[PDB]
Design a protein around this ligand. Structure first.
Ligand SMILES: [Mg+2]
Ligand SMILES: [Mg+2]
Ligand SMILES: [Mg+2]
Ligand SMILES: [Mg+2]
Ligand SMILES: [Mg+2]
Ligand SMILES: [Mg+2]
Lengths: 97, 87, 287, 250, 129, 105
């Protein structure tokens, strides 16, 4: 019974809307623009992970470091608890040593 | 379609308003002004005379030099007396 | 090429035809199914399946190997030991031959770095470059080179080829500026003075046998003759050489760059050099 | 008068410049108004489809920031108290009503916060990807060189009919040197079209080159691309970021 | 207080170059470091081995597992299979057996088991690459 | 206005060598005109543009660099190309009586 009895409404994807059509433009802004701008400066997203990558523990440390003072009280409490938990997990649990 | 205008570095110096509380402190000191001058020259609007130590700063630098970096003659004298004692 | 002809024959290359190079993408292993499920490769009970086996280096209670060995000063003061990147005469000759280092002008650390002949890391306690005798028997370049250390044999080779070598000290700050001047010029600070060597290094740079930059130039001819005698070559009188001025140019002990004095500010934006005129500033930058 | 372009950059002795027809958009029939020599190291490099895949996937993923986040058992509301004692109840042992086993509990291993997928291929690899894309278009006859993008009119129908007449693809990526100097006629024509996309030279990339069936370049754009891409060959190790001043780098 | 001047030559001297300079013309070859420019005109062999951006022969030692020694001729253009045949002919007398090799026709490289970097560099110099 | 679409079918004319050598004489003379080198952009463009205008079939950019000699140009122009779809290619291939092909596209 975990099966729907009617076909879902058709999903129409416009492969040539402006976003898809211009996707990727200026990804070579650096190598084609005398390196005035790095491609990572094209990244739009959270301030604490623009042009940066890491596992969850590193992400949480960076988030607290960069916007921790602007976080809501309970969100910051949750972040501190998450950092503590992830520290314990990554430094004390696991198959490998 | 046509691509949006390419992203470009903001031309010329960037002077944040010190009144704004959200302006980072590292963007308000003399070092920021010195870097702006190095980067943009006269267009910066930085008075070139501000790039050198002010007299109090010069006095502090001279005091630090006297305190920590001895003269060549002093170093040589210390070496000579140490050698004499060892001999 | 035949590959491009094959392309001409094949269907259009699009985002629906792309495939990673075989062997570059290992399959992902995840714990579902008979072979990778059940206990999921973790064993059976105990701390290792629970995920709580002791720290690395713990030996079950026995005093660990890395603790039962006595402490010894292998790495004492490691971060304060001075490090000198080696520059063999082989490498120097290679750079000169490929034109990445111009022997017609004085060779200092800036020129070496610009030619990419050496990589200096002041942050890693690199105090400069040490000349290395490796390649001496085939060195045939007349060069005016400034280094921080120099072996006796390297000095001998440099001088036999009719060149000049001087050992010049650099504090970490001056070394950073010398290795990467352009970033320093963008910092917008007046060129600082080059600090003097520490007391332990003073004798080295005041000794003429090392061609120290603080050594008495009166003793240089004697030392050069001694090396020529020891290594069996005739000392060439560089004064007669048509590049004698270049071979003689030496930056002042408190000078970082050849033609720039301490205290100057380099405005690269408009190609200018601002020089202080205040008497106090001038006295400071000359001291 | 033929519009003949020669290769400005030095060409390797063992390689001969590849060639293309310089066309024009001023007429439906103006398919051959000149001959351009294109640098072989940019337009006749090896067909590295694997490098194309590397660069395409980098373009797709390095900007990606997934905003999916779930609540762990710590962050789900409530669930502090032990639901019932360890023993005597006859029920399974539990420590909170928000553990993953419970309906409404936390997600044991869910998407955690905004996660970046950022990574940078070596700029040499990315430039090589651009070169490979250009070579592939030229070899598959999807590359067309124009003297200029000037159109007789800004009517999109003219552009579509021109592409159809010249047997271009359903999708055309027109490239011009800089944003400011792009002709107003072509700007107007492509502003109203979905499959005819007009970009500056600085915006050229493997992803859009592949998405669009045909690639239209102007002669100045060709010279610009040759210069920029060949520079990656025959450059030293960076001593510091190339944005900083160099002796010979604009 | 401030006195501007144009002694910017001593700063242009410090500016580093972004492009690798072409090697200067030498009266006699091989150069004291041993370097030798490729002969002009290029050899008429079915294949070509382009020099590295440093203007050296692209022959590199490689090591894996700490015991698998290989040598890679990397920037090969043309008939990589003709190059493989030539390399096998040149190396079999040295080894006594035909060397085991891998021809990466895609990347245009030839990988030979065992270290032969010096011999292959000399051989390519003789062939004029 | 969009003219009628140019059919890609091309059958080499019978007097192709004569026409080609006439065009070669017009553009450029010596014996063995087959071996005339097209290294010059002016001459290559003139010859290839004339041939394309006359025969309604141009050398694609992909093959353009391969036209090192008038012999190469002759080789390119003496090989026919047919634009018929696979439907035609199959149906007009003497299908056996028990094989029937229909196309709904
Ligand atoms: Mg099993
Ligand atoms: Mg169990
Ligand atoms: Mg056990
Ligand atoms: Mg709780
Ligand atoms: Mg919930
Ligand atoms: Mg390796």
């Amino acid at each position: 019974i975990g099966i729907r009895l009617t076909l879902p409404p058709p999903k129409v994807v416009d492969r040539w809307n402006e976003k898809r059509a211009m996707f990727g433009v200026y990804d070579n802004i650096g190598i084609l623009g005398n390196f005035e701008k790095h491609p990572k400066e094209l990244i739009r997203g959270p301030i604490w992970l623009r042009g940066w990558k890491g596992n969850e523990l590193q992400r949480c440390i960076r988030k607290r470091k960069m916007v921790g003072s602007r976080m809501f009280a309970d969100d910051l409490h949750n972040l501190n608890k998450r950092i503590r938990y992830l520290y314990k997990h990554f430094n004390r649990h696991g198959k490998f040593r | 379609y046509r691509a949006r205008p390419p992203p470009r570095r903001r031309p010329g110096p960037r002077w944040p308003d010190p009144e704004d509380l959200l302006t980072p402190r590292w963007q308000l000191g003399p070092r920021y002004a010195a870097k702006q001058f190095a980067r943009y020259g006269a267009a910066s609007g930085v008075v070139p005379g501000s790039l050198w130590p002010s007299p109090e700063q010069l006095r502090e630098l001279e005091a630090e030099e006297r305190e920590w970096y001895p003269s060549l003659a002093t170093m040589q004298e210390s070496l000579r007396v140490k050698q004499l004692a060892e001999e | 090429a035949r590959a491009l002809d094959l392309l001409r024959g094949l269907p259009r290359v699009s985002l629906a035809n792309l495939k990673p190079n075989p062997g570059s993408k290992k399959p992902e292993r995840r714990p579902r199914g008979r072979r990778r499920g059940r206990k999921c490769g973790r064993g059976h009970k105990g701390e290792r399946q629970r995920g709580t086996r002791p720290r690395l280096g713990f030996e079950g209670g026995q005093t660990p190997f890395y603790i039962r060995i006595p402490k010894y000063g292998f790495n004492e003061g490691h971060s304060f030991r001075r490090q000198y990147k080696p520059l063999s005469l082989n490498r120097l000759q290679y750079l000169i031959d490929l034109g990445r280092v111009d022997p017609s002008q004085p060779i200092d650390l800036t020129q070496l770095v610009n030619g990419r002949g050496v990589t200096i890391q002041p942050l890693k306690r690199d105090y400069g470059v040490q000349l290395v005798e490796e390649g001496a028997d085939t060195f045939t370049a007349k060069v005016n080179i400034e280094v921080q250390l120099a072996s006796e044999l390297a000095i001998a080779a440099i001088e036999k080829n009719g060149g000049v070598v001087t050992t010049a000290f650099y504090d970490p700050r001056s070394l950073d500026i010398v290795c990467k001047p352009v970033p320093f010029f963008l910092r917008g600070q007046p060129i600082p003075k080059r600090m003097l060597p520490p007391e332990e290094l003073v004798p080295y740079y005041t000794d003429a046998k090392n061609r120290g930059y603080l050594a008495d130039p009166a003793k240089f001819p004697e030392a050069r003759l001694e090396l020529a005698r020891k290594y069996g070559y005739i000392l060439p009188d560089i004064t007669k050489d048509e590049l004698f001025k270049m071979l003689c140019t030496r930056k002042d002990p408190r000078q970082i760059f050849f033609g720039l004095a301490p205290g100057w500010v380099v405005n690269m934006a408009d190609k200018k050099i601002l020089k202080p005129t205040d008497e106090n500033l001038l006295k400071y930058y000359t001291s | 008068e033929p519009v003949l372009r020669k290769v400005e950059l030095p060409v390797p002795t063992h390689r001969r410049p590849v060639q293309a027809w310089v066309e024009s958009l001023r007429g439906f029939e103006q398919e051959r108004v000149g001959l351009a020599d294109l640098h072989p190291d940019v337009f006749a490099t090896a067909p590295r489809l694997d490098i194309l895949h590397q660069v395409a996937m980098w373009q797709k993923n390095f900007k990606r920031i997934s905003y999916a986040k779930t609540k762990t058992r710590a962050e789900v509301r409530g669930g502090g108290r032990k639901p019932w004692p360890q023993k005597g109840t006859g029920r399974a042992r539990h420590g909170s009503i928000r553990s993953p086993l419970w309906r409404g509990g936390g997600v044991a291993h869910g998407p955690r916060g905004p996660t970046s997928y950022y990574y940078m291929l070596p700029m040499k690899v990315r430039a090589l990807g651009l070169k490979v894309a250009l070579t592939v278009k030229l070899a598959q006859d999807d590359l067309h060189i124009m003297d200029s993008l000037e159109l007789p009119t800004g009517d999109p129908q003219y552009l579509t009919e021109l592409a159809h007449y010249r047997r271009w693809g359903d999708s055309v990526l027109l490239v011009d040197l800089t944003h400011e100097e792009m002709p107003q006629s072509i700007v107007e024509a492509t502003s109203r079209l979905k499959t005819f996309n007009l970009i500056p030279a600085v915006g050229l990339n493997v992803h859009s080159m592949l998405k669009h069936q045909t690639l239209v370049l102007t002669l100045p754009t060709v010279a610009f691309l040759e210069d920029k891409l060949l520079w990656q060959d025959s450059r030293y190790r960076p001593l510091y970021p190339f944005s900083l001043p160099y002796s010979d780098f604009p | 207080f401030v006195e501007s001047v144009d002694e910017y030559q001593f700063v242009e001297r410090l500016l580093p170059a972004t492009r690798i300079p072409d090697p200067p013309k030498h009266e006699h070859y091989p150069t004291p470091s041993g370097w030798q420019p490729p002969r002009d005109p290029p050899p008429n062999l079915p294949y070509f081995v382009r020099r590295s951006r440093m203007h050296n022969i692209p022959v590199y030692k490689d090591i894996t597992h700490g015991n698998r020694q290989m040598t890679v001729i990397r920037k090969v253009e043309g008939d990589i299979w003709a190059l493989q045949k030539d390399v096998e002919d040149f190396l079999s007398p040295l080894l006594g057996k035909t060397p085991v090799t891998q021809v990466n026709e895609v990347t245009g490289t030839l990988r030979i088991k065992g270290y032969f970097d010096q011999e292959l560099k000399a051989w390519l110099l003789e062939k004029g690459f | 206005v969009c003219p009628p679409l140019r059919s890609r079918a091309y059958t080499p004319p019978e007097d192709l060598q004569s026409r080609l050598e006439s065009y070669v004489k017009e553009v450029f003379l010596p014996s063995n005109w087959q071996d005339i080198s097209l290294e010059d952009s002016r001459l290559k463009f003139n010859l290839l543009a004339h041939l394309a205008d006359d025969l309604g079939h141009v050398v694609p950019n992909s093959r353009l660099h391969q036209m090192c000699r008038v012999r190469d140009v002759l080789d390119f122009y003496n090989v026919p190309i047919q634009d018929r779809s696979k439907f035609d290619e199959l149906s007009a291939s003497n299908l056996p009586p028990n094989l029937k092909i229909t196309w709904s596209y």
